Amino acid sequence: ALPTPHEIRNHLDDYVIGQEQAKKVLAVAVYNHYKRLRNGDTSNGVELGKSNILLIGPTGSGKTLLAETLARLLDVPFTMADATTLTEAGYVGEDVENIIQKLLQKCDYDVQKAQRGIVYIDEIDKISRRDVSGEGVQQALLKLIEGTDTSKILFICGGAFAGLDKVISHRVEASEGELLAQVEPEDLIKFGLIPEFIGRLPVVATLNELSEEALIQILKEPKNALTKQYQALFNLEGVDLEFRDEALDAIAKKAMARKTGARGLRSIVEAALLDTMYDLPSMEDVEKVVIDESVIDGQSEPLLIY
Amino acid sequence: LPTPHEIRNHLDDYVIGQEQAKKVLAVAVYNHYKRLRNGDTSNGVELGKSNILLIGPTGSGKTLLAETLARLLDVPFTMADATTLTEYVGEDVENIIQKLLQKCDYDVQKAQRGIVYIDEIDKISRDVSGEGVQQALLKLIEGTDTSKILFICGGAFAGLDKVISHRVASEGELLAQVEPEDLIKFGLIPEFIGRLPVVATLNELSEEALIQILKEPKNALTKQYQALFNLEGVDLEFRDEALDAIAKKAMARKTGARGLRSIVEAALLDTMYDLPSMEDVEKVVIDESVIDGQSEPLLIY
Amino acid sequence: ALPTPHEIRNHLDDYVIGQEQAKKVLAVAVYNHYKRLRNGDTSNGVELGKSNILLIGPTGSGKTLLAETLARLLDVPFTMADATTLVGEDVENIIQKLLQKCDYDVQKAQRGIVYIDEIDKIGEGVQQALLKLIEGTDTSKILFICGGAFAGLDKVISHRVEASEGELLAQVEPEDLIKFGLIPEFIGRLPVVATLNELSEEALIQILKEPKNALTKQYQALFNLEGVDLEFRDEALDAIAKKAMARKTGARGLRSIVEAALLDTMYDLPSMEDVEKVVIDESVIDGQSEPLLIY
Amino acid sequence: ALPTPHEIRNHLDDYVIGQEQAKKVLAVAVYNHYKRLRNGDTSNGVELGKSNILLIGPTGSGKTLLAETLARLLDVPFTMADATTLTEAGYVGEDVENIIQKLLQKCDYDVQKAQRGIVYIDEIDKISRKSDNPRDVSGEGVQQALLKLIEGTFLQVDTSKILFICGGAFAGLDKVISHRVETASEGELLAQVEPEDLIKFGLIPEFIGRLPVVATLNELSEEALIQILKEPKNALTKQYQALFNLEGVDLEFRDEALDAIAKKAMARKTGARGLRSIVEAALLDTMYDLPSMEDVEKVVIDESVIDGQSEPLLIY
Amino acid sequence: LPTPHEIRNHLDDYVIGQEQAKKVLAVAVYNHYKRLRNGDTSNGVELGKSNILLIGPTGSGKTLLAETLARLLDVPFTMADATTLTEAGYVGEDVENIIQKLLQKCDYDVQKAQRGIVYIDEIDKISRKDVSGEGVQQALLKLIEGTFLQVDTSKILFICGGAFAGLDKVISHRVETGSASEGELLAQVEPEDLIKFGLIPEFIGRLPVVATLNELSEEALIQILKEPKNALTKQYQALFNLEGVDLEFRDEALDAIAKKAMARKTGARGLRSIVEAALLDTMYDLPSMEDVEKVVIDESVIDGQSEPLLIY
Amino acid sequence: ALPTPHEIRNHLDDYVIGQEQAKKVLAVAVYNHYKRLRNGDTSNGVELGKSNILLIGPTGSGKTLLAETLARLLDVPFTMADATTLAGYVGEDVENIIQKLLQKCDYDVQKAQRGIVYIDEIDKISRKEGVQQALLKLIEGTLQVDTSKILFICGGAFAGLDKVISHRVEASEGELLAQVEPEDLIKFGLIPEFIGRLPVVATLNELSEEALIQILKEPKNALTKQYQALFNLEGVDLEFRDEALDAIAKKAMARKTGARGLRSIVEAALLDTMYDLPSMEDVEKVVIDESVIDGQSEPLLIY
CATH class of the missing domain: 1.10.8.60 (Helicase, Ruva Protein; domain 3)
Structure with missing residues (x-):
């Protein structure tokens, strides 16, 4: 029995302080994702869009904490990964799948429960374009987001995005919390993220x-x-x-x-x-x-x- | 093979407007596969490869058209961004091919019939690093085989609407007067544009x-x-x-x-x-x- | 077996139209370049002069095509480069690119040809940086072909020779390019000068x-x-x-x-x-x- | 037998006047550094964090003298280097390893003792790429180049063991601190110094993190x-x-x-x-x-x- | 040892005017050799080496003063241009070239070579205001301190000459008060002024005695x-x-x-x-x-x- | 018996055409140089200043020919050298020019000191360098032969020189190269200490x-x-x-x-x-x- 977004947000109040809006977005994004897995990829002749998440907030805001609690509240396998340890490599393309074997490890090697698992990538703002190699991960890791299956697993990309608060201002022209609400897919584009990557992260959450x-x-x-x-x-x-x-x-x-x-x-x-x-x-x-x-x-x- | 009329009709179900652009894409795609089946050489004469260059604003449907073209022809399709290549990337240029094979079940023949869409081509327009990609990715267009695969290069070309006016109504009417020399002054090298004969424009x-x-x-x-x-x-x-x-x-x-x-x-x-x-x-x-x-x-x- | 300038020019007539004088020059210059490589830098106690090429013609005259064709007709590695883009450590990039299309073969890469487009565009730092290559540090073996439109070149020549642009570009001299913006040490590295109509x-x-x-x-x-x-x-x-x-x-x-x-x-x-x-x-x-x- | 921070500070009082706080910080930083090299990089299953130093004080306050003294007091190979000599050259990243050969030179080419050595880079504040006192692209390259040293990479000597002390006046640092702490004297303000203040000054986040210990001079x-x-x-x-x-x-x-x-x-x-x-x-x-x-x-x-x-x- | 008075007096026979400059040089020269004879350490205290930095327009008598000082003390003299050092790491081994030339004019006598004088021209030229230009300041710095001749440069007196065209400006931007001639402005010169000009602190600290020509x-x-x-x-x-x-x-x-x-x-x-x-x-x-x-x-x-x- | 400047200029008219002003300058310079060697470095209590020459003119104006000719007209050993081919190991290659002068001099120390040295393409080493000071050591004078006695002649095109002079004097190049000054060569790339060694300057048109x-x-x-x-x-x-x-x-x-x-x-x-x-x-x-x-x-x- 899936917990309603109301319930999901409720138990999130017990592990993290404040961040009510972001916890509203995550609760919805998480619910819809698993509500789509149980029913199936196709629903009533219509194909449902995978709603992956992108966490944008300062370091120590609770980005990592939030991704961890979501997994505990849903008794679902969870694994972490750093986008910085991925940059500068063509052999890291075989290290991008490494994040999958660790998921199975903490999943008792269960293929089905592994597909229900959640994957959190930290410091995504760091790989934004060495530039070619750094992007190499944006496109390599990108292959995962689609699913080759990694189609079922939920992806959560966290990042501080220091310079993101400046590009938004050069476009929207209050406080950083007010400016991060005006965030747009085109803002991250100018930051260093490729269009094909951002398109895979529809759900965008911001922390204060x-x-x-x-x-x-x-x-x-x-x-x-x-x-x-x-x-x-x-x-x-x-x-x-x-x-x-x-x-x-x-x-x-x-x-x-x-x-x-x-x-x-x-x-x-x-x-x-x-x-x-x-x-x-x-x-x-x-x-x-x-x-x-x-x-x-x-x-x-x-x-x-x- | 579906006639240019049929191709254009199926594109009307996925993309709206852009009728002129879809007319050009229908003919270019048709001629490309019409050439692959017949052969590179036809009746003692060598046929010219007709690659495409989509020029339209962001969110106009440049990407959708490309994806649709592949689906309507049950042909493997892979995407890629030009800003990713700019600035050891020569070995990353061949990466787009292995991805094409991945979605092609590693079939060499069906991979050659494939379509490749490179986005944000206007970004690499120089600076030495950006040009190094226009020449590295250039090695693919000819073919080394990447000769059989269709290339569709998309881009917004913000400064393109200005250079055209400096040479020659609305932006749609100005993007219709676009010429190879206009993309030259924009930042694209001569050898690259010559590899993209077909030019579609979106409103x-x-x-x-x-x-x-x-x-x-x-x-x-x-x-x-x-x-x-x-x-x-x-x-x-x-x-x-x-x-x-x-x-x-x-x-x-x-x-x-x-x-x-x-x-x-x-x-x-x-x-x-x-x-x-x-x-x-x-x-x-x-x-x-x-x-x-x-x-x-x-x-x- | 090296193709005579006759043959070289003849296979040029199959890819390029007209420019018969440009192709006669490219033929001798190219023939003599490789004829020197096979025999050796020093020949009979005398040191042979490296004959690099400078292509001067309007945009879309066949400069790029002439260069590329030269490479194919001699099964020799070819690579282009834009002078506008040029960065000292980027000048050697043209080399690795020459090795990429050469299967990383040191000998065949030295037999390769390099075309630098829009030389008339360049700034001085590049003329001297790319200069180090022309000599060779080896890039001594590779043939260089610098192309350019040289819009203002038609004027400087007229202010000295004082017909059509084709007639004036035939009166082209090393000092004319000097007044244009090229340094004396750079032009001296491009002995062969080919003009396109x-x-x-x-x-x-x-x-x-x-x-x-x-x-x-x-x-x-x-x-x-x-x-x-x-x-x-x-x-x-x-x-x-x-x-x-x-x-x-x-x-x-x-x-x-x-x-x-x-x-x-x-x-x-x-x-x-x-x-x-x-x-x-x-x-x-x-x-x-x-x-x-x-x- | 390693000298206690008390001892080190005590002997620094015989060459440098005042700066008592700065000497107390240097004494602990230096002690910890060599207390780590002797014991080993890893200790009891935990990896010890390298504690390099950043000297912040007006010209002629004692920054250079303090650095030199520390080395003499510990019979350790000492070498200097200006951060101004690094900017304006692309191959200067190889002139950075030059500072290493000069270390072995005064160390008799002894690989081990050279790793125990101390390096002092002067005028670090000058290489910061910012709008204050307007090459930025070349200056930042140095912070990232010299950076490779701090971590540690034909001497074969690893720069992971040598202590680094980067000195600098940081004129405009007095200002950025005041635009943050606002709601005293410069000495009081330089005490309020924070890694984010240097960031706004012109130092990259990856470089400051390599300089944990910050000693200020009055x-x-x-x-x-x-x-x-x-x-x-x-x-x-x-x-x-x-x-x-x-x-x-x-x-x-x-x-x-x-x-x-x-x-x-x-x-x-x-x-x-x-x-x-x-x-x-x-x-x-x-x-x-x-x-x-x-x-x-x-x-x-x-x-x-x-x-x-x-x-x-x-x-x- | 000729007293400063004598030294200055004989300088009057070779150079016209610049009386203040010659006074500075005389004292510095006297003290330097007065130090060598007595010894580096004197009465438990270490004497400070007093090298010279000449600052004046081109053709004011900088080079002539340097040369004349050597003749007035029968001491081996050698010149060098700071521009010959700029833009080279191999010039680190060309910096020692200046020493072998000194030994050359000294009949390979290590002692008399240490008593010699070295005049570096166009120091203002190598001021990074860069990497290669500064590389000299620090390289040539090694000499000023002192280090197969086996000769130590600690003993040899150094005289760095230069025009310093811009120095005239920086000195006015400091000595100004709220809202004279270059001669009067060059007297106000301070170690900090040369810093802003393009000389490194560690280099200026090695040139205590500063002389100015009109x-x-x-x-x-x-x-x-x-x-x-x-x-x-x-x-x-x-x-x-x-x-x-x-x-x-x-x-x-x-x-x-x-x-x-x-x-x-x-x-x-x-x-x-x-x-x-x-x-x-x-x-x-x-x-x-x-x-x-x-x-x-x-x-x-x-x-x-x-x-x-x-x-x- | 030394040839008067008149005689020296007359025999130069037989090997080179035009350039009468330059040849007058070379005639005087050379005459005085050798007029000093015979008499002695010191003369009547006053030290005479060595008058080395700096030829400034287009490539092929006769700079090299004039130099060679002067030596033949004085039966004096002559040797050339390129400033381009002139490094720290080249400091020992600078003295090479000397051993070559002795070779054509039958290894005679005295006649070698009377010799003439011509350095070509001086305008090529101007920093705009270490050779200028390495070769400078020669101009002054240090085989056991002293180079203090040998007359030096440095030829060069000086392409950009025409420009620097114009930016100060502000006719034809011939009138501009007459306005040449020691400071002009400074901005061109020649060091002061080197130009001071070349007092006699001759130009060609x-x-x-x-x-x-x-x-x-x-x-x-x-x-x-x-x-x-x-x-x-x-x-x-x-x-x-x-x-x-x-x-x-x-x-x-x-x-x-x-x-x-x-x-x-x-x-x-x-x-x-x-x-x-x-x-x-x-x-x-x-x-x-x-x-x-x-x-x-x-x-x-x-x-």
């Missing part, structure tokens, strides 16, 4: 403010997360670095107030652990624990356990 | 054109959303005032036929969001729900 | 008939596989020539005229059942009356 | 400059006192004169750099007719520095 | 033709001398020669090319006559229509 | 019919040698009569194209011959005047 939980994940989940990197730098000191949740959240908030987004996470953490790293090799303690009082107030020093 | 679609595009085509937008609403147990009815409203919205945005979908989605957005959570008979879309996207669609229980 | 009214008519690939023969063969005989009257062929000159398109604009004159006919041709179709003058110049239809 | 104050003329083992006063010393004459710099030299330096904004050019023009006349006299000592008062009207006192 | 005036030019031990008039009076003919230059004729030199803006460099065009006809048919002396008047210089006076 | 004849024969890259080798690989021997070569010179002077317009003349006269050459079977082809001037008659064909 950053997501506290999104940023918090960027400081933890990634294999190269700041916290992980520092924990390892403190580790070769014979010192265990622990980040308390309150602290992480504190950090995210600071990054939003400064509108620096994920890009400004390090500058914060660095000033937070600056004093500690300086006089750390001059002490003898088991671990250092970072609290919220240390991050927000910047008043109290990080705790120390001997 | 700027009006209101009634867009309206029929939303209705007539077997894959019309309305038919699609009606089918989507249909598997919900609901009937979708687009009032005439509503469809004309969509067309106008499209014209105001200059997006042509391509902007049609983005318009239809916005209007039906709220509706499809709370459709499966109701229990009615049919939904009626009117002009008040499109032009301003203000009032909600009509719900009959 | 303007395809006249009679020349254009011949281009429509004489060539093995003339337009009339191409359309007569197209109408031929339809069971129809296509006939072009002389008054009609002259009409097309006049249409091309008024447009200053030259021979490049010949096809565009014939196509528009045979558009309506080819459209409703497979729908008829006649013996032959005759193209008269009224159908070309006027474009009002339809071609004659004999059943 | 404008050497009066008292700072005065100390520079006295305290340093090779201070100007101690140099001129040495030149006058081998003439049988004692040179005395009244504090009134030293602060006067500082002010002259501040007004010109030349920082510590413009120090020697001031002292020379003051002592030019005296040193000309010095070997032609016979007195005990020459006393330099303020009136010789500021006014430059009066001549130094001569004690017979 | 533009030679009429009376100045007039003296250059007479006073210098190798003045032109003295050279030609010797050429005519070995012909048994006395050459006399009227004051009115010398002043005329000065004016011609200014109108052409060639400074002192353009003097010779003026004297030669006047005495050309006369030197031609001189070994074919038999007179006592020749007298060059103004009418022969300015007008160039009338021939020199011949006395029998 | 007329082409030499004989000089052009030489260019067609003497040079290792002469047109005749280039075409004779082209005909040679055809099994044919190309012969240029003296009256045909001269015929070429005049044609080139009538068009004022100098030596740059010698190729386009020789081609137009051997164009027909080269066309139907690979289609014959003869021994040699003789080019006569009628073949050049008249252009009517074809070259003689010996079977």
Whole structure:
């Protein structure tokens, strides 16, 4: 029994904050897609158009988080992929199908459930035209969107599109949130995306403010997360670095107030652990624990356990 | 083989207006396949390959025509963009061929009967990198075989309407006076234009054109959303005032036929969001729900 | 076995009409270039001079065609390049392109020919950058052929020699190109200078008939596989020539005229059942009356 | 045995004056860098992030001296390079690896020690492609070229192990920061510095991300400059006192004169750099007719520095 | 060691005017060699090497001052043009060429080669205001510090000459106040000004001693033709001398020669090319006559229509 | 006994035509140069300034001929050198010009110092470079032979020179090249330190019919040698009569194209011959005047 767009959006409120309009578009785009799979590709003599999605929002806005939750709420296999690891290769054409084998991997090799799966491509704005090779993916990955079958699987392309806020202004001529609503297929064309690619992404969603939980994940989940990197730098000191949740959240908030987004996470953490790293090799303690009082107030020093 | 008349008649079911352009495409396509069957050489004389160059605004139907031509002739069809090649791309030029074989079941013969449509040709017009493609992709036109495959190059040619005037009414009347030398000054090399003998010109679609595009085509937008609403147990009815409203919205945005979908989605957005959570008979879309996207669609229980 | 300038020019008469002087020059220049490659750069203690070619003629005179034809008649790799496009590291791009069509064979690529279009357009940096190639750093073996219209060249020559443009282009000198905009070190790398005349009214008519690939023969063969005989009257062929000159398109604009004159006919041709179709003058110049239809 | 950040900072106090915050940052950055090379790129299943440095401070604030000192204090091969020498050439991306051969040169061609070396690129702010102070296409190419080094790629030496320190005045950076933080002094503003501020300045996102650690330098104050003329083992006063010393004459710099030299330096904004050019023009006349006299000592008062009207006192 | 006074004094015999410049050079030169003899380190303190940067119009006496200094200290002297260095990496090995030429004029004596002087002309030319041009500033920089001759350039004194046409402007854009002559503007020169001109900081820091020359005036030019031990008039009076003919230059004729030199803006460099065009006809048919002396008047210089006076 | 400037100019009239002003300058310069070597570098307490020469004129004006002639008229060793063929290893190739001067001097150090050196195409190394200073080392003077004594003469066309002078002086090229100044050569691409070494400057205005004849024969890259080798690989021997070569010179002077317009003349006269050459079977082809001037008659064909 498929969840109505009302239900889909409802459970999305539990994992992501704000972004109500985008969550309305995704709820509809997702519903229609699976509502088309169950019934069939052809419906009453008419062929239904595949409605793939394009997420446009700043880094750490929750683009990745949204694509993940949609899969969990529909108990459907989910896999990620970076468009940057695809650029500059003709052999990556055999690496574009790699994203498919990973889908089957987390799908127990079930062909049918795999076709119901969702694929999220991060940083699509990066491949927009090296220019020839970068585009090579736009057209290589393009073969997937159609389906050779990848026709059934839903595609979600996320991107920050920094320069997108400028091209739209040169055409529509409020705030970035107001300008990103005026987005058009021709706007992405001037950005660096090919017409045949954009035509495959009918559904276009836009995010506004950053997501506290999104940023918090960027400081933890990634294999190269700041916290992980520092924990390892403190580790070769014979010192265990622990980040308390309150602290992480504190950090995210600071990054939003400064509108620096994920890009400004390090500058914060660095000033937070600056004093500690300086006089750390001059002490003898088991671990250092970072609290919220240390991050927000910047008043109290990080705790120390001997 | 279907006569040029038949080809033009089947194109009337998928594309609207552009009658002159479809007359040229019908003859060019007919002569091309008429040549392949007979042979490259005919009665001691060598026949000239007649490739096509579509020149029309964005959303005029340049791409649709191409796709339709292939379907009406049960011939493999592949698309490609010129901006993709500009600036190691010589080995990416042959990529368009492997894609043609992919949709051709790897049959060498049927692949030669295939049609290739390169979009945004006007973009590569120089700068050394753009020209390098006009000469690299040029190696395909002749054939090295890519000699048998039909090439259809499409483009908007924004600055073309200006150079023609500097040499020679409306843009449609000015695009009829187009000459090989006009594309030269535009940015295309002599050797390239000479490979594109046939030149078709498309006009700027009006209101009634867009309206029929939303209705007539077997894959019309309305038919699609009606089918989507249909598997919900609901009937979708687009009032005439509503469809004309969509067309106008499209014209105001200059997006042509391509902007049609983005318009239809916005209007039906709220509706499809709370459709499966109701229990009615049919939904009626009117002009008040499109032009301003203000009032909600009509719900009959 | 190298083809004599006689033979070379003779096979040029099969692809290009007129320009008999241009083709006599290209023949000797090309013959001597490869004759030097086979024998060697140094010959009998004397170092032979590399003879590169400079093609000067109106747009659509046959410059590009002459270059291409030279390559085919010598089974030698050929590659074009636009001087307007030119970038120092892009000058070597013309080379890799020559290797692409040469199957990456170093020896056959050195036997190759390169045509640089619109040299009159260039700026100076290119004249000196592309200069490094002419010498060779190897690009010493490859034959270079620089084409150009040189609109203002007809004037500078007149301000010195003080007939027709054909007569003046024959008085062309290295110093004339100097005043034009070319550097002394660049022109000195192009010893051979070939001039092409303007395809006249009679020349254009011949281009429509004489060539093995003339337009009339191409359309007569197209109408031929339809069971129809296509006939072009002389008054009609002259009409097309006049249409091309008024447009200053030259021979490049010949096809565009014939196509528009045979558009309506080819459209409703497979729908008829006649013996032959005759193209008269009224159908070309006027474009009002339809071609004659004999059943 | 690696020196602690305390130790490193401590020894930096023996060559560079003030900039305490900047030295604390450099001390941690440098420590971490070599603490990583010894342990290994990967540590306990986690990959350590390379911590290159970006020096932001006015001309003659101590950027060059700090870089050089760090290397001496760690017996490590040091080499410099101007970012201005990279622009205007297409093959200059090969002149970038030239900085590597110069590293091996001062390192005795030892592959291992060379990887432990430190590189300092001056005037990075000058290669930024922006509308501020209007070649952009060639300048940006450098940021992306030198970039390949930061990551790491016939020396065979990998540039992944060598520490990079990119210095630059960043004149207009004071401004862009103020157009963001708005709702104090430049020192207070350069503390508010953010990777996005440099972006608007003219640096590409891929380059800034390679420079995680950012150390800022304040404008050497009066008292700072005065100390520079006295305290340093090779201070100007101690140099001129040495030149006058081998003439049988004692040179005395009244504090009134030293602060006067500082002010002259501040007004010109030349920082510590413009120090020697001031002292020379003051002592030019005296040193000309010095070997032609016979007195005990020459006393330099303020009136010789500021006014430059009066001549130094001569004690017979 | 000659005192700065002596050094400047003997410079007066070779160069006219530029008294301030010679004062700067004298002091710098004195200190440099005063340093070499004593040693790099003196009394626990390291002395600062004081290299020179000459700044003045073309033909003001830059090159002459450099050369003269060497003769006044019997020291090996060699020139070089900064333009010969620009646009080359192989010129990094041509930078060391300047040293081998010094050793050449020094009989391959490593010590006396280290005491030598090197004058680099047209430094203002290599100012990137680029990559190849700057490549010299940093390459030639390596020398100024000091590094198979085995000679160290640390000891050798460097003198970088140049016109710096644009420097005149940048100095006015700084010293200006709200809303004098170039001589007065060139005195205000500061290390920061050269920075904006196109010289790298690390290079200017190696040229502490900065000297400035003024533009030679009429009376100045007039003296250059007479006073210098190798003045032109003295050279030609010797050429005519070995012909048994006395050459006399009227004051009115010398002043005329000065004016011609200014109108052409060639400074002192353009003097010779003026004297030669006047005495050309006369030197031609001189070994074919038999007179006592020749007298060059103004009418022969300015007008160039009338021939020199011949006395029998 | 040294020849007076009068005598020197008179014997130059026998080998070169026109260029009377230049020859007057060369006569004085050379006279004084050798008048200084005999007397001594220092004279009556005053050091005499070395007067090196800079020939400025069109290609084939007689720059090279004048130089050679001066040496013969003074029985003095003469050697040429191209500035083009002149790198860091070429710094040791610059001294090569010296060993060549000793070779033709029987390795006599004294007579070698009395020798004359002519450097061709100086206008070709002007940066607009390292050779200017590498060769500069010679002009001053450093085999053990000092180059301080040898007289230097640097010839060059200086194509762009005509322009730079016009942008300052603001007649014919002959009147413009008379206004030449040391600063003009500066902007052209010559370094100050080099121009200062060439005090005596001589300009030329007329082409030499004989000089052009030489260019067609003497040079290792002469047109005749280039075409004779082209005909040679055809099994044919190309012969240029003296009256045909001269015929070429005049044609080139009538068009004022100098030596740059010698190729386009020789081609137009051997164009027909080269066309139907690979289609014959003869021994040699003789080019006569009628073949050049008249252009009517074809070259003689010996079977």
